[PDB]
Amino acid sequence: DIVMTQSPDSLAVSLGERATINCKSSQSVTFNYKNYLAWYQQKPGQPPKLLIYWASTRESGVPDRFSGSGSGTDFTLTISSLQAEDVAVYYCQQHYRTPPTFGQGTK
Amino acid sequence: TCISECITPNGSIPNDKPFQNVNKITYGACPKYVKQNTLKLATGMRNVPEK
Amino acid sequence: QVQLVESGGGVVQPGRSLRLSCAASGFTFSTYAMHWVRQAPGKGLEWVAVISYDANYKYYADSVKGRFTISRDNSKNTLYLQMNSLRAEDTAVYYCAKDSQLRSLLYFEWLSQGYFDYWGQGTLVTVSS
Amino acid sequence: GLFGAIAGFIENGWEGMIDGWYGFRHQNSEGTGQAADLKSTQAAIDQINGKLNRVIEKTNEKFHQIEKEFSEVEGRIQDLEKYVEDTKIDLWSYNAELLVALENQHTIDLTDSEMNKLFEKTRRQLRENAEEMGNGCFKIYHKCDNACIESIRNGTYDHDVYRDEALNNRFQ
Amino acid sequence: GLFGAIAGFIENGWEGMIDGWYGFRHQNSEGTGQAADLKSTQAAIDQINGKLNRVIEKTNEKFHQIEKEFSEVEGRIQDLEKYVEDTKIDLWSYNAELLVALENQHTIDLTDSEMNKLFEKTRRQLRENAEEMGNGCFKIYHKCDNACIESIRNGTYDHDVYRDEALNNRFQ
Amino acid sequence: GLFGAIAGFIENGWEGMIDGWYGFRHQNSEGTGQAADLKSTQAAIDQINGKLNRVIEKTNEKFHQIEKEFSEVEGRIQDLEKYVEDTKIDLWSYNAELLVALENQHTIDLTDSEMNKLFEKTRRQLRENAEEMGNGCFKIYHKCDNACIESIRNGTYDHDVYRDEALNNRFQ
Ligand SMILES: *[C@@H]1O[C@H](CO)[C@@H](O[C@@H]2O[C@H](CO)[C@@H](O)[C@H](O)[C@H]2NC(C)=O)[C@H](O)[C@H]1NC(C)=O
Ligand SMILES: *[C@@H]1O[C@H](CO)[C@@H](O[C@@H]2O[C@H](CO)[C@@H](O)[C@H](O)[C@H]2NC(C)=O)[C@H](O)[C@H]1NC(C)=O
Ligand SMILES: *[C@@H]1O[C@H](CO)[C@@H](O)[C@H](O)[C@H]1NC(C)=O
């Protein structure tokens, strides 16, 4: 197994301002120039849709303003400014090693 | 009643492979008919066990 | 595009069984490794298991290992899960996702999977009597 | 292969290694054991994978195909209808037969190459502390317990700690 | 690639080497500088030249080509005309997509070899007076001026002159 | 060639070696001399003989071949009967020209590899008693007479017996 933080725990921002979560793993998650790490959105009672993947790529067809970065173990989401359609549960997750290891839940 | 893209006169085949040997008549997204009936690709290393 | 309508889940009492189902339309299903993913309400999100596109590689997370039996059919484009002897902290909803990686060769317990791409509609289960 | 590790200076492969493709075996003071190396395993599988996916994104979605079996003896047009398929099918076999055979000789020489790679990652760790026996085996020249060689396996080996000992065991 | 120098034991590449494809970077008593190694930057470019040139001459020049688009429905003779060309097309497309895929894999592996080749050219010159750190870097075991770095790079190093000086730094 | 053994780090080839394809020329107290290493020479020959036979297993035993010359000017049908054949020939040649190329490229790279493989296998066997001269010659650092030499050639050379002698010739 392998362990994923989301520190600090819960978000408490207002409407129209930047902010940042922080995901940390035990074993490193970089191998052959690719960073194995993907997040998710879950509007309570809807099964999750995909946010970032492989570290810093946008989702299938996601909003323009989100950003994601970091290498190795020290990753960092960054939302541009909190909008109306942004009131859901969140996680970070790795897929470098089976079993894929999840987080706890960001409101 | 089933699902299968490729139909031959012999009947439906799977197009997960690249090459069929079933029948040279097809209809649909059908693998390329070839003469051979088995062509195996390596999915692993050379196997060198003991005696 | 992609759809993943599920099936067949409700309540059943302790130490019992039910087989779940997962339809899949809108992508060549028989070339993508498939998952099951669960949450207990409010607490942490959790991983169940996986089943290679092959149909001949399966791996579980220790919490259900030795009780469960995952599988799939490819003429009828669907994924199940067979549950036998349900335990205490099991009460949860289940969700069939799609692995991103193409024909991932799951040759060993521990190999790098790919990120969870798409997600099924749902199914309700509660180990309760 | 072309590198002559696998089925080369590596006498023969290991049937008791179920958790990995390439990996380590020690003998030492404390006992003797075996572990897989996970990166070089994943390395190899991750190519053989993409390779496979590449070999397969094709299936002739074309296109109103022509008649190929026959009710009669018709002469000229029929003849060409057969020549045209009989020919295609000859080519498309050659194509297939070549493909596997290249793909396969590469798929082999590639995994041989990885076993070299692991071997050169390991020599370069043991700068002047070890010597190559010649059979994929290193003689370290210093006392090395199950926590020591674990360093080597997980790439965290410092060589200057042990240098003074090892050198003296080797050259004196 | 196969040889695992580039994208391998050599962490990454020098975006600020602009007179060549392979080379050296020093740190010595006199400071810090860099030079391209030409011989190897030539032989890597010289195969790619041939290779390209080989891939190119080649142009289908024949012969009163058949009609390919059609303004009526005619059934059989047409049905064949199209299927003849439709089939041909799929062949060349494959024929092509294989070539590029093949060539490249090789272009990538030969450029890799050339690096590892230059790595082992150096190693053998510095017979005993240095040791491979494994990040594509040596640690020469003596004092070496700009005149001695540039003497290594232009083939004219003399292991024996700095021999005695080398061994004391290593062992004692 | 990929490995740099032949046509490269080994200056040129020995025109006076007729026993085999890979060899050992020496110099010691008991004059000089040559000898061919067979375990290698076969190894290559095997691989060639092998691909030779892979390359030739086919003869297009395909049915009724249409008319390919023509006596009169006819039109649509004759036109398609030429286009079909013209097109066939153009591919078969593309295939044909690519086979010789890939195969030949490989054959070279393969014989290169075997040289290097010998040279490694030997250096390993010589653990700490010689140094790579640079040109694919060694410097054995003791008194190795024609007896001893062959030991190294046919594998039986036990390094420990000498070491003492050679360690002292190297660093004293
Ligand atoms: C790789 O393995 C090493 C050695 O087995 C581990 O090192 C840790 O820290 C010290 C320093 O050498 C060791 O004695 C312990 O065995 C380890 N302790 C703990 C608390 O982890 C370590 O697990 C691995 N290296 C890294 C950098 O994580
Ligand atoms: C290759 O470059 C070297 C390194 O600078 C050159 O070194 C000169 O060599 C001669 C003796 O051969 C000396 O007079 C000087 O030390 C060097 N002169 C200068 C101006 O640097 C040399 O020209 C080249 N090597 C050879 C063997 O010709
Ligand atoms: C090598 O050949 C010579 C005789 O020519 C001798 O040293 C020895 O018997 C041989 N070694 C082996 C292993 O046959």
**Is E135 exposed, middle or buried (CB count within 10 Å of its CB: 0-12, 13-18, 19+)?**
exposed
Nearest CB among C103, C107, C111 relative to D52 is that of C103
Mutate to test the interface with E, among D6, D83, D91, D129 (most CBs of E within 10 A): D91
Q: What are the residues whose beta carbons fall under 8 Å from the beta carbon of E43, sequence distance 6 or more?
A: E114
Q: What are the residues whose beta carbons fall under 8 Å from the beta carbon of F141, sequence distance 6 or more?
A: F129, F130, F131, F165, F166, F167, F169, F170
Say if ligand 1 is within 6 A of residue D35 CB: no
Residue C99: count other Cβ atoms within 10 Å of its Cβ: 24
Say if ligand 1 is within 6 A of residue D156 CB: yes
Indicate the top mutation candidate among F154, F157, F158, F161 to test ligand 3's pocket, ranked by most ligand atoms within 8 A of CB: F154
Per this entry, what is the length of chain A?
A: 107
DSSP-derived pairing of the beta strands A67-69 and A49-50: unpaired
Phi (first) and psi of residue E163, to 5 degrees: -70, -65
Tokens standing for residue B26? 């097809």
C80 strand-pairing partners: C21, C71
Residue D114: count other Cβ atoms within 10 Å of its Cβ: 25
Cβ–Cβ < 8 Å for D34, D24: yes
CB contacts of C112 in chain D (<8 Å) are 42, 46
Q: What angle do CA C7, C8, C9 make, to 5 degrees?
A: 105
Partner C contacted by B1 (CB < 8 A): no
Dihedral sign, CA of F21, F27, F28, F30? positive
Distance F164 CA to ligand 3 centre (A): 24
Span between the terminal Cα atoms of chain B, in Å = 52
Q: Map tokens 């420990």 to a residue.
A: F160
Tokens standing for residue C27? 């992508």
User: Which of C108, E2, F117, F47 has the alpha carbon at shortest distance from D10?
Assistant: F117
Amino acid symbol at A98 = T
Q: What angle do CA F95, F97, F103 make, to 5 degrees?
A: 95
Say if ligand 1 is within 6 A of residue D146 CB: no
User: Which of E45, E9, E58, E28 has the alpha carbon at shortest distance from E152?
Assistant: E28
Mutate to test the interface with F, among D73, D82, D83 (most CBs of F within 10 A): D83
Q: What are the residues whose beta carbons fall under 8 Å from the beta carbon of C123, sequence distance 6 or more?
A: C6, C7, C8, C9, C20, C93, C94, C95
CB contacts of D51 in chain E (<8 Å) are none
Cβ–Cβ < 8 Å for B18, D103: no
Cβ–Cβ < 8 Å for D9, D117: no
Per this entry, what is the length of chain C?
A: 129
| 3-state DSSP assignment of residue E95 | helix
Partner F contacted by D99 (CB < 8 A): no
Cα–Cα dist C97/A47, whole Å? 10
Q: Which domain holds residue A57?
A: 1-107
**Is F50 exposed, middle or buried (CB count within 10 Å of its CB: 0-12, 13-18, 19+)?**
exposed
User: Which of E110, E136, E125 has the alpha carbon at shortest distance from E40?
Assistant: E110
Residue of A nearest to C40 (CA): A104
Tokens standing for residue E48? 């790619």
The three-state DSSP-derived secondary structure of E121-137 is HHHHHCCCCEEECCCCC
**Is A48 exposed, middle or buried (CB count within 10 Å of its CB: 0-12, 13-18, 19+)?**
buried
Ligand approaching nearest to the C-alpha of E157: 2
Strand order in the sheet with A49-50: A49-50, A37-42, A89-94
**A38, C109: Cβ pair inside 8 Å?**
no
Cα–Cα dist B14/B5, whole Å? 7
Amino acid symbol at A65 = R
Atom of ligand 2 minimally distant from the CA of E151: 4
User: Which of A25, A19, A27, A20 has the alpha carbon at shortest distance from A5?
Assistant: A25
Nearest CB among C42, C100, C109 relative to A98 is that of C109
Cα–Cα dist D84/D123, whole Å? 59
Cis peptide bond N-terminal to A99, omega within 30? yes
Chains E and C touch (3+ CB pairs under 8 A): no
Q: How far is D101 from chain C (nearest CA, A)?
A: 21
* Structural method: X-ray
DSSP-derived pairing of the beta strands B19-20 and B32-33: parallel
Cβ–Cβ < 8 Å for A39, A51: yes
**C107, D45: Cβ pair inside 8 Å?**
yes
Phi (first) and psi of residue E85, to 5 degrees: -80, -45
Distance E145 CA to ligand 2 centre (A): 13
**CATH class given for the domain over D1-172:** alpha beta
Q: What are the residues whose beta carbons fall under 8 Å from the beta carbon of D113, sequence distance 6 or more?
A: D1, D2, D3, E2, E3, E4
Mutate to test the interface with D, among C30, C52, C59, C107 (most CBs of D within 10 A): C107
Which residue has a Cα nearest atom 23 of ligand 2?
Answer: E151
What does the buried/exposed string (b/e) look like for F130-148 if buried means 16 or more CB atoms within 10 Å of the residue's CB?
A: bbbeeebebebbbebeeeb
DSSP string, B1-51: ----SBB-SS--B-TTSSEE-S-S--BSS--EE-S-S------S-------
Q: What angle do CA E22, E26, E32 make, to 5 degrees?
A: 120
Tokens standing for residue F134? 């640079």
Cβ–Cβ < 8 Å for F15, F120: no
Chain C residues 20-39 with a CB less than 8 Å from chain D? none
Q: How far is B2 from chain D (nearest CA, A)?
A: 20
Sorted by where each begins, the domain ranges of chain E are 1-172
**D52, C105: Cβ pair inside 8 Å?**
yes
Q: What are the residues whose beta carbons fall under 8 Å from the beta carbon of E69, sequence distance 6 or more?
A: none
Tokens standing for residue F167? 């360690």
Chains C and F touch (3+ CB pairs under 8 A): no
**CATH class given for the domain over C1-129:** mainly beta
Contact partners for chain E, using 3 or more CB pairs closer than 8 A, are: D, F
Say if ligand 1 is within 6 A of residue D154 CB: yes
Chain breaks in chain E (C to N over 2.5 A) after: none
Would you tell me the crossing angle of helices E38-56 and E76-125 to the nearest 10 degrees? 170
DSSP A58: P
Residue F31: count other Cβ atoms within 10 Å of its Cβ: 8
Q: Map tokens 């030249």 to a residue.
A: E49
User: Which of A47, A21, A27 has the alpha carbon at shortest distance from A107?
Assistant: A21
Amino acid symbol at C11 = V
Chains A and C touch (3+ CB pairs under 8 A): yes
Cβ–Cβ < 8 Å for D135, D57: no
In chain A the beta strands, taken as DSSP E runs, fall at: 22-24, 30-31, 34-35, 37-42, 49-50, 67-69, 74-78, 89-94
Q: CB contacts < 8 Å between B and D, how many?
A: 86
Distance E138 CA to ligand 2 centre (A): 23
Cα–Cα dist D112/D107, whole Å? 9
Q: What angle do CA D90, F63, F99 make, to 5 degrees?
A: 30
Resolution for this PDB entry, in angstroms: 3.4
**A53, C59: Cβ pair inside 8 Å?**
no
